[PDB]
Design a protein around this ligand. Structure first.
Ligand SMILES: *[C@@H]1O[C@H](CO)[C@@H](O[C@@H]2O[C@H](CO)[C@@H](O)[C@H](O)[C@H]2NC(C)=O)[C@H](O)[C@H]1NC(C)=O
Ligand SMILES: *[C@@H]1O[C@H](CO)[C@@H](O[C@@H]2O[C@H](CO)[C@@H](O)[C@H](O)[C@H]2NC(C)=O)[C@H](O)[C@H]1NC(C)=O
Ligand SMILES: *[C@@H]1O[C@H](CO)[C@@H](O[C@@H]2O[C@H](CO)[C@@H](O)[C@H](O)[C@H]2NC(C)=O)[C@H](O)[C@H]1NC(C)=O
Ligand SMILES: *[C@@H]1O[C@H](CO)[C@@H](O[C@@H]2O[C@H](CO)[C@@H](O)[C@H](O)[C@H]2NC(C)=O)[C@H](O)[C@H]1NC(C)=O
Ligand SMILES: *[C@H]1O[C@H](CO)[C@@H](O[C@@H]2O[C@H](CO)[C@@H](O)[C@H](O)[C@H]2NC(C)=O)[C@H](O)[C@H]1NC(C)=O
Ligand SMILES: *[C@H]1O[C@H](CO)[C@@H](O[C@@H]2O[C@H](CO)[C@@H](O)[C@H](O)[C@H]2NC(C)=O)[C@H](O)[C@H]1NC(C)=O
Ligand code: NAG
Lengths: 441, 439, 439
């Protein structure tokens, strides 16, 4: 890059030089079509069924879409036996009583179990008919939420576009990175009917290009959105341009001032020079400039003599006139001009505000480093941008904080494999009891 | 649809004709007020209670709002015998019964334990699982609430953003600021003719681009803003667009470019001129301009298309001493001023060159011409089609799987444990009867 | 305040007066840097694991970031009776034994089944409970990422939509807090600071935000604020309408429209003129213009409001040979040039016609005039109010219902099953005593 400004004291004007043209002469259409990723909604019952996220998101969406659509148009021995009989009488009689006691013991236990059973049913029944429904009710609601999120996630680009269009009545400048991806833009450029350097220029300058392009909504249907992107095409590259700035000029033997009217970008076209009257039409990036033919004015290279002379055969030369002294200042790409006339005081101050130059009732130029500020009378002009105060906004990190539920399975299964100890034990006791009795007859 | 261009070789200029005016002369105010749908947050305990969605969403929101706020300012046969055989018998029974007793002990301890355990099962449920089920139940209620807040408050939120990004004023009036339904009935209410209304209705897009929305007042639960719509003081006047290219001469050394380009368009007996694009937009043969900065001029302006020099109108122009060659693209073709040493070329659709340029100033049109080149600069008379780009989507899966319990088969086992108890009791029943027969 | 318009009949032009300047002459850079609040994702298994919200959101985000990055470059004896007795007892005991068998098998089953209940819980339900517990952790994490990273996200978008540079500096790029203190740090006078502070809106509209550098976890951009090198000078707005009543020095007719409309406004002993709206914005009696393309002119310009022709200033004008009639709306009323055959009308609030126009050039004002018509074109001097639109919202329901367990009533049953065992053991206890008394 080799940008320079050269100041023309005799015309109180300054030109910035060393820029390279790129001039729109046309447009490249392209038709981008986007499928929605649709949800098929799963009619279950969630926790609270006035809540219907999926239904609702769809409506929200569908509606946006309609909105846009609208834009388009006993008896006892005796003697003996004696005592013995009655020993057995006594023994038997104990046993009877002991057995009755046992019976009532088994009744107790039976009723115990009858109840523990009665209760285990209820435990099951809580689970099956109380908890379990609202577990897998949640399971549903979650499936919904997930679905919704994932709809916005995967349909992101479409949605972004949809908004963009809603907010712009279906037409945008800058072609957002949602309308066109870099990858896309880049290959799209590739496909343009232009020279190879041209392609490379465009590729190394996506920002400008986007700023220079439009996106027009084409057609919206619930499940497809298509729009036309509109890119610039340059009919010339690499011709030199220059920016002209202009400040009033007065004699001193008083009486007359001149300000040259025609400021802006000049920039060579086919053997002739194209002039673009207002910022608007041009953007610039380093030593690269990009302007739009559309409204340009075509003029002869003889325009240039106006930087030196004004009055000179060859070009009448747009100007404005004053009878009275006017003083002021004009900031350029690479310094500033200052026209200090009549009674007015002018000052160039440096980086730290120390005053370096002071102004001899005429028209001078200064530049960055050296000059940071000029004042004319009470107005202050800043030759450089004033740096100040960074602001900083910190973030912490965010916590996926989950804690599983876990069951004593093993220790429990122990207890049980051990209740079976007892039954297994019990049965074997009876087994033994019965043997003894099938030995009685 | 009768748009045309007629080229004026003697003024190296072209006019696009057959357009119909609509010219802004005023504004139509309307005050749109929007209620927020507020959440009443339900202080439960969610799964992890550093997480506080509803509280948090509300703050986000509330804050946006503050921000905007700030923008505003039999008895026999020796029997002794039997006795002793009964004595051994008794003695067996004793032992047998003890064995049974120990059996009932075992079972009792079995149950004592199975009981001890069923309690624990219940207790896991009640005091372990059940909290964190209906903790989840809470967090979900929240999430749902949040989502549904964004859903139902959508339009408001969209607006709120729009305003934050635009410091409280927008052009295009979005479909979020104004619905078609709304815009339409609003138009209906405007103090204009009926055709006028119909024009507006059949052109919403332009209208919206021509309208503003200004934020009026924001309160946590209400937002109100003023929409600002255009009003046309005239419809259906012809307009035309003028394009203009340099014109040089021979017998020696003057070049003319007509300065005054843009839209002309008839007003009350006189003609309104709008200097820059900006002011005008156009849809088919319909044009919409803004008086605001217009210049009013006499019909006599028209003779300038033919003559330039002529009594009646001094005529805006710029001057060159030296030959200047170039090209200018029109609505419906192109102009090309080929002068001095420069070479000029019109090529067709496929780039086959059709015309080559006789050192003057000519016009060409679409079909026929696709491209003109002046020296090394290339101009495109038509937009170049290229490469559709396509971006596919699949469809997305609501993927839920219920949990279900063997209820019947379980209830079977149980209604069947009761088999055994019912059975057991009856066995004892029988035993007892036999004993109340012993005395 | 004190805004006024004074109309100059002899120049068919009107000036609005009493505004106070503020004029851009520099910029103030500041570099804002924003940390992302990052998620450390928790690789669990959720309900359906094709779903991966956190992974997915991050990708969405990370991608936006890459995109932006790319922008940058007879009956019975005893004994016989005892005999029979024993024999009864045997049978009765057998019956008891089979009773204990029944109960044993009953328990054997109830046990068999309680295991299954546990196992459903442990191996069926419990996994999918704390699968949901995971999925929720995720959803929450996602939401909370958008919530806490809100500002950054809003910015990221804004930049994506504008190819990395915006005007209005949104409240998301700069908070009022920030803007305010930023202003405070600017190298300007105190009144100046106060001005800016009482006018945030304009300031914002006058500022730019340029994206500076993007990394996955930090975004930094430069805000660019205006600096005025003069405040509190008077400015005035000039409006201009055609004039057919005129003459110079033996020069009969000619119709004149004064070219140089827009904002004038005093600078260092000279006057700065800003040719198009664009450059200037205004809030009450406060005006804000941009030096950048201004034209510096002598106070003598003002005589042009009175004379046009006068030594001292040649005076930008345009010319017509022919009568041109029209109307021009001003800040505080309207001008109307009614010439030749044309009919002109001022109507009030309700459309009752007040004035009718004597073939010259007049001014009117708000209250009094609401409408002027020139021929068929209608101009609106005031904005037409109409129809408020209203959009209601209800409030939204956090609707949660806890699950609760009969714990007490259950524990009652069980503390009561132990009644029975406790009872049963005691019955055996008593049985055994009786038997260790047999020998
Ligand atoms: C969940 O979805 C259905 C449909 O709503 C549920 O049915 C509801 O409740 C009972 C049936 O258990 C019915 O009397 C009603 O028809 C439903 N309620 C209403 C208000 O209509 C059912 O519980 C679940 N569905 C399935 C397929 O098992
Ligand atoms: C209770 O005892 C029974 C019967 O004696 C067990 O069943 C058998 O026992 C052993 C395992 O302890 C195996 O070798 C056999 O193959 C089993 N066969 C069948 C067909 O069941 C029973 O497993 C025991 N249970 C407990 C918990 O002690
Ligand atoms: C177990 O036994 C109980 C009580 O003895 C049964 O209750 C029966 O209920 C009906 C009700 O109409 C009565 O007519 C009978 O008197 C009862 N039956 C008997 C045999 O006494 C109960 O149905 C039985 N339950 C199970 C699960 O087997
Ligand atoms: C069932 O039996 C046990 C043991 O006899 C009871 O526990 C005892 O209760 C008393 C108080 O009443 C305490 O002083 C003892 O220290 C306990 N001892 C043991 C070994 O447990 C038990 O509480 C009884 N109650 C129920 C409701 O089952
Ligand atoms: C769930 O948790 C809340 C608060 O987090 C509970 O409030 C508790 O109240 C006691 C006093 O009774 C406090 O000392 C504790 O700070 C709270 N407990 C815990 C575990 O944090 C309340 O029990 C529940 N609240 C709701 C709304 O359901
Ligand atoms: C949940 O499921 C994962 C997903 O596979 C689990 O990985 C387990 O471990 C083995 C390897 O040792 C895998 O092949 C199995 O799929 C899983 N088996 C079991 C018994 O859990 C893992 O435990 C969980 N999550 C993560 C992120 O690892
Ligand atoms: C750009 O700078 C060079 C480098 O020395 C200088 O010689 C020249 O004057 C500049 N460019 C042009 C086009 O004159």
């Amino acid at each position: 890059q080799n940008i320079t400004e050269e100041f023309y004291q005799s015309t109180c004007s300054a030109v910035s030089k060393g820029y390279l043209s790129a001039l729109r002469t046309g447009w490249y259409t392209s038709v981008i079509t986007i499928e929605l990723s649709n949800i098929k909604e799963n009619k279950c019952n969630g926790t609270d069924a006035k809540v219907k996220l999926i239904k609702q998101e769809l409506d929200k969406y569908k509606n946006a879409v309609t909105e846009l659509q609208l834009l388009m148009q006993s008896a006892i021995a005796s003697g003996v036996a004696v005592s013995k009989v009655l020993h057995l009488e006594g023994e038997v009689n104990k046993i009877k009583s002991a057995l009755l006691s046992t019976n009532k013991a088994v009744v107790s236990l039976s009723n115990g179990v009858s109840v523990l059973t009665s209760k285990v049913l209820d435990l099951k029944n809580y689970i099956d008919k109380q908890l379990l429904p609202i577990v897998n009710k949640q399971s549903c609601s979650i499936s919904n939420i997930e679905t919704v999120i994932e709809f916005q996630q995967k349909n992101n680009r479409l949605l972004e576009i949809t908004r963009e269009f809603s907010v712009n009545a279906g037409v945008t400048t800058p072609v957002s990175t949602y309308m066109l991806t870099n990858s896309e833009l880049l290959s799209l450029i590739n496909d343009m009917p232009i020279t190879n350097d041209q392609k490379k220029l465009m590729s190394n300058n996506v920002q400008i290009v986007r700023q220079q392009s439009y996106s027009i909504m084409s057609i919206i249907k619930e499940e497809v959105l298509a729009y036309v992107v509109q890119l610039p095409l340059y009919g010339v590259i690499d011709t030199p341009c220059w920016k002209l700035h202009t400040s009033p000029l007065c004699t001193t033997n008083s009486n007359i001032c001149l300000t040259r009217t025609d400021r802006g970008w000049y920039c060579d076209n086919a053997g002739s020079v194209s002039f673009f009257p207002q910022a608007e039409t041009c953007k610039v990036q380093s030593n690269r400039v990009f302007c739009d033919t559309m409204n340009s004015l075509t003029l002869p290279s003889e325009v240039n003599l106006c930087n030196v002379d004004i009055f000179n055969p060859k070009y009448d030369c747009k100007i404005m006139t004053s009878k009275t002294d006017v003083s002021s200042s004009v900031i350029t790409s690479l310094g500033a001009i200052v026209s200090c006339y009549g009674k007015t005081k002018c000052t160039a101050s440096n980086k730290n505000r120390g005053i370096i130059k002071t102004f001899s009732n005429g028209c001078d130029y200064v530049s960055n480093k050296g000059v940071d500020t000029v004042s004319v009378g009470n107005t202050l002009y800043y030759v450089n941008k004033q740096e100040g105060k960074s602001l900083y906004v910190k973030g912490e990190p965010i916590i996926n904080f989950y804690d599983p539920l876990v069951f004593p399975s093993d220790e429990f299964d122990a207890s049980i494999s051990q209740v079976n100890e007892k039954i297994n034990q019990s049965l074997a006791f009876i087994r033994k009891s019965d043997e003894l009795l099938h030995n009685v007859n």
